[PDB]
């Protein structure tokens, strides 16, 4: 599924991401835009052999099992294919673990390079929340 901007903001709010670990809702919408262009089916292969999956591009070396990343962990205890669903529950639950790991939202390279330090409230302007 390809989400609309305000559609995704509402779903993320219903799943408890607004102000989770102190990150306002616009941060999460900004990260999704630049990681996946709001597309739940997005995949990207990395140089080290792992693959990133889903709307928040969660990586197979640490967080999910895809059967082809040797010597990796599965810290969210899910198959990576669960992260491509139109329902974002699995992506939201795993993202909550990642942002609690110590480095906050800096774990998402696109957030650090394109969202951090900007006016992220603009990503939820005009939405009925």
Active site residues: 35, 52
Q: Judged by CB under 5 A, does residue 40 bind Na ion?
A: no
Interacting residues with Na ion between 52 and 71 (CB under 5 A) = 57, 60, 65, 69
Count residues contacting Na ion (CB under 5 A)?
A: 7
Tell whether residue 104 is a contact of Cl ion (CB under 5 A): yes
**Count of residues that bind Cl ion according to CB under 5 A:** 1
CA distance linking residue 56 with residue 127, whole number of Å = 21
The full 3-state SS of the chain, as one line of letters, equals CECCHHHHHHHHHHCCCCCECCECHHHHHHHHHHHHCCECCCEEECCCCCEEECCCCEECCCCCECCCCCCCCCCCCCEHHHHHCCCCHHHHHHHHHHHCCCCHHHHCHHHHHHCCCCCHHHHHCCCCC
Is there binding between residue 91 and Na ion (CB under 5 A)?
Answer: no
Q: Which does 72 bind (CB under 5 to 8 A by kind): Na ion, Cl ion, none?
A: Na ion
Nearer to Cl ion, 79 or 104 (CB): 104
Q: Is 101 annotated as a binding residue?
A: yes
Site of interaction with Cl ion (CB under 5 A): 104
Site of interaction with Na ion (CB under 5 A): 35, 57, 60, 65, 69, 72, 74
């Amino acid at each position: 599924k390809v989400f609309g901007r305000c559609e995704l903001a509402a779903a993320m709010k219903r799943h408890g991401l607004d102000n989770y670990r102190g990150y306002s809702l616009g941060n999460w919408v900004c990260a999704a835009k630049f990681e996946s262009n709001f597309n739940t089916q997005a995949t990207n292969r990395n140089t080290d052999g792992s693959t990133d999956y889903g709307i928040l591009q969660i990586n197979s070396r640490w967080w999910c099992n895809d059967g082809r990343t040797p010597g990796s962990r599965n810290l969210c205890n899910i198959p990576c294919s669960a992260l491509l669903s139109s329902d974002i529950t699995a992506s939201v639950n795993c993202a909550k673990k990642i942002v609690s790991d110590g480095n906050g939202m800096n774990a998402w390279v696109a957030w650090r390079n394109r969202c951090k330090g900007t006016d992220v409230q603009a990503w939820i302007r005009g939405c009925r929340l």
